[PDB]
Amino acid sequence: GTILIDLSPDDKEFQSVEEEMQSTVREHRDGGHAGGIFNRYNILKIQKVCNKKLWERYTHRRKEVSEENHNHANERMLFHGSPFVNAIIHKGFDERHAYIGGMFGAGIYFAENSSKSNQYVYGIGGGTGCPVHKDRSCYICHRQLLFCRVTLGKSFLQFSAM
Amino acid sequence: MAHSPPGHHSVTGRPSVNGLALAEYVIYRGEQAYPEYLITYQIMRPE
Numbered sequence: 001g002t003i004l005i006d007l008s009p010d011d012k013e014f015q016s017v018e019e020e021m022q023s024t025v026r027e028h029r030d031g032g033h034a035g036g037i038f039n040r041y042n043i044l045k046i047q048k049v050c051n052k053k054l055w056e057r058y059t060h061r062r063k064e065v066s067e068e069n070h071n072h073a074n075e076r077m078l079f080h081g082s083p084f085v086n087a088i089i090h091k092g093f094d095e096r097h098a099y100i101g102g103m104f105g106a107g108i109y110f111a112e113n114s115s116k117s118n119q120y121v122y123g124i125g126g127g128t129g130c131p132v133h134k135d136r137s138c139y140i141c142h143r144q145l146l147f148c149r150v151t152l153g154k155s156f157l158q159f160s161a162m
Numbered sequence: 163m164a165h166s167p168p169g170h171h172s173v174t175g176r177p178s179v180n181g182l183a184l185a186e187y188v189i190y191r192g193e194q195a196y197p198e199y200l201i202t203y204q205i206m207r208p209e
């Protein structure tokens with residue numbers, strides 16, 4: 001099972017994750033339609049996600065990929081926003097968490113921009129926004145993002161008109 | 163879920179018009195990601 005360990009805001013690890021969140025906010029071409037209008041976040045909590053089984057599943061695949069890619073896992077830390085965040089931290093990522101209509105194929109999507117992942121917290125296109133206010137730019141309701149270890153291996157480079 | 167491009171393990175989607183937009187990445191096996199941190203937050207209204 002998964003356990004969640006709170007990081008102290010006085011801890012360098014907390015501060016490093018917060019800085020990655022804050023420093024990768026950008027403006028979006030929808031003017032804030034999907035994710036809201038903001039330049040920064042109020043970080044309320046950062047938890048480490050610990051699951052021995054899921055870790056071992058991850059490291060087993062990382063080793064396979066690294067060996068296929070001539071001893072290079074090409075591992076990154078990347079953001080993921082999803083309406084399935086609760087399920088992901090308990091069960092791990094699988095095909096239920098893919099973006100079937102994504103422009104780079106039916107797969108699981110991650111971002112370098114925290115604000116790009118923020119657009120998916122309430123669903124594709126921001127859905128109907130937060131449950132309580134139906135507001136994609138809600139400043140009241142708490143949101144959750146994941147900051148994930150991701151094995152890219154040999155990555156196919158696709159330029160996109162975005 | 164689709165398959166990776168042959169000989170590849172992921173896709174890097176790189177915005178070519180917006181120069182301030184960072185990359186997006188796609189994996190086709192759930193085992194290639196681990197949800198290391200869970201971040202709880204609010205967006206802030208600009209002043």
Ligand SMILES: COc1cccc2c(=O)[nH]c(-c3ccc(C)cc3)nc12
Nearest residue numbers: 080081082099109110111117120186
């Ligand atoms: C274009 O899709 C994305 C780009 C960068 C990041 C994400 C991201 O963090 N999450 C999702 C996303 C899309 C659909 C569903 C169902 C769940 C997550 N899509 C993304």
Ligand SMILES: [Zn+2]
Nearest residue numbers: 130133138141
């Ligand atoms: Zn709300």
